[PDB]
């Protein structure tokens, strides 16, 4: 059975909890961090992502590299409608590469403030760049909610033709 440890990091209030909830039991693998196993059925068999919702512990806790060790992939999330949440992206990115090396990482721009249709201007800055794979997502119509997982799954399995069923 295919299983992967996925680290989910991001500022508080960026929709990390809601994001996970919608793809649903949970368990504690350590202090202040719940792990939520998510199973996706695909044309290559079931794939399970054990999502660690660090919940800011990487900033305030004491496990040090423990939060990231053995992670096979990661999702960095921020709020495209409150861009100060992008502040720590470089630090999270550096730490993930330092502790895990070249693991696949997806950057997710969540539109938390679902009341202002000029997010196609606040987000344009992130489609650019290129170092990390970026996706616009939003709690509401679960827009692209599966995209990050699909991209990671393809990279992890090494199958560009992988599809979720």
């Amino acid at each position: 059975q295919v299983q992967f440890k996925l680290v989910l990091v991001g500022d508080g209030g960026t929709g990390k909890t809601t994001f996970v909830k919608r793809h649903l039991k949970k368990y504690v693998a350590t202090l202040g961090v719940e792990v939520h196993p998510l199973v996706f059925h695909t044309n290559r068999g079931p794939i399970k992502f054990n999502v660690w919702d660090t919940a800011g512990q990487e900033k305030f806790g004491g496990l040090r590299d423990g939060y990231y060790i053995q992670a096979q992939c990661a999702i960095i999330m921020f709020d495209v409608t409150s861009r100060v949440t992008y502040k720590n992206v470089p630090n999270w990115h550096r730490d993930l590469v330092r502790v895990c090396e070249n693991i696949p990482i997806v950057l997710c721009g969540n539109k938390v403030d679902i009341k202002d249709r000029k997010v196609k201007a606040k987000s344009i800055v992130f489609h650019r760049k290129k170092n990390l794979q970026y996706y616009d997502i939003s709690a509401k119509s679960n827009y692209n909610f599966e995209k990050p997982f699909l991209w990671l799954a393809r990279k992890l399995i090494g199958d560009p033709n992988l599809e979720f069923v």
Partner: protein, 388 residues
């Protein structure tokens, strides 16, 4: 009326470097990055230039405030409806003579010449926006903090504000989740607990059996305060020993930091990023403590986590120090500026993005024939105030 040694009065020019994705460089709609100090155009001479997490606030010689950067939470304190307006300096409508400003991640504070404090933007905690002065409510415009005593200094962490009064009392407000307010029990750390946010957002005094203070400083999630007697007190986050050896990862009760017990030493300045602290004494020596990764301690390669202030030897006499999220700076008595730490965001001014485990002198066209007056750094950018 009010005065404090921390107030700046020497007119200078503002330079910025680093990332500018959201306008924090103040160089226009298409300048997203500057590897070397770049001149920011302001209509007047500037006496203070502060870097918030993702925004910049400058104070003019006449007492007018200018801002640029991310205004999603109201941090700029001005209308940025017009596309691109947040990417260049813009005036903050405040008919007051401001003498000092401070900036956090989503808030900005301004101190008037008569001791009144104006604040705008919002504070955030580990669950999102908690409000500014009223629960769950940010302010896009300057609002006065209600206090019946004159304030002489304002200082900001990422999401908390500290105000030193003319009498030596220290008032704090904002997020207290890590103990950085020094007046809230761990039991009420999470949004005030059952009693709610009111307790966190209303300015209240730091009460210690009472001790008065002559200065105060803020790291990202912790606070340092120097008592009238010269003793160093700290509270807030210390998971990487940023406060020394408080004995806990979150220090809610203000503590006379043993790691800073002098005798012949007089601590005069403190600064801090997320996981490190840089301080200086009355003799112009700089010290660092906390997490060592990416060289943020400036103690050379191979450096390891420190729980006591450790001397940064590769530095000339220092006049001031500052910290970015993962970088450190020191301005020398002779007007030069040194930098060290994570180089990823181009905050070092070396021209390269490689980390610097030892202090490196910043050089560049905009620094030629000029002396550095001050340095302030945010999450991905840095701001310098220079003079010819």
């Amino acid at each position: 009326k009010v005065s404090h040694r921390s107030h700046s009065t020497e007119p200078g020019l503002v330079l910025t470097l680093g990332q500018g994705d959201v306008g924090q460089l103040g160089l226009g709609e298409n300048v997203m990055e500057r590897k070397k100090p770049a001149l920011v155009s302001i209509p007047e001479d500037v006496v203070q230039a502060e870097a918030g997490g993702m925004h910049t606030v400058c104070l003019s010689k006449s007492g007018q405030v200018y801002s640029f950067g991310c205004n999603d939470e109201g941090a700029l304190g001005r209308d940025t409806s017009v596309e691109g307006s947040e990417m260049v300096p813009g005036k903050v409508e405040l008919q007051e003579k401001v003498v000092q400003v401070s900036a956090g991640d989503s808030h900005t504070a301004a101190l008037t010449d008569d001791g009144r404090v104006f604040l705008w933007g919002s504070f955030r905690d580990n669950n999102g926006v908690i409000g500014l002065l009223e629960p769950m409510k940010k302010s896009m415009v300057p609002v006065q903090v209600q206090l019946d005593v004159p304030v002489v200094k304002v200082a900001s962490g990422n999401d908390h504000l500290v105000m030193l009064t003319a009498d030596g009392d220290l008032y704090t407000l904002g997020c207290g989740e890590q103990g950085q307010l020094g007046r809230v029990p761990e039991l009420f750390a999470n949004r005030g607990g059952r009693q709610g946010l009111e307790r966190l957002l209303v300015p209240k005094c730091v009460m210690l059996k009472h001790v008065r203070f002559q200065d105060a400083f803020c790291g990202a999630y912790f606070t340092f305060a120097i008592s009238h007697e010269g003793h160093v007190y700290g509270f807030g986050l210390s998971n990487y020993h940023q406060l020394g050896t408080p004995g806990t990862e979150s220090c809610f009760i203000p503590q006379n930091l043993t790691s800073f017990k002098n005798s012949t030493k007089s601590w005069v300045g403190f600064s801090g990023g997320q996981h490190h602290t840089v301080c200086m004494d009355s003799e112009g020596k700089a010290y660092s403590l906390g997490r060592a990764e990416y060289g943020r301690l400036g103690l050379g390669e191979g450096a390891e986590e420190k729980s006591i202030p450790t001397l940064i030897s590769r530095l000339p006499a220092v006049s001031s120090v500052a910290c970015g999220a993962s970088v450190g700076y020191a301005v020398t008595k002779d007007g030069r500026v040194f930098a060290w730490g994570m180089g990823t965001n181009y905050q070092l001014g070396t021209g390269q993005d490689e980390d610097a485990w030892s202090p490196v002198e910043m050089m560049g066209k905009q620094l030629e024939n000029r002396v550095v007056l001050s340095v302030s750094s945010g999450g991905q950018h840095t701001v310098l105030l220079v003079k010819d």
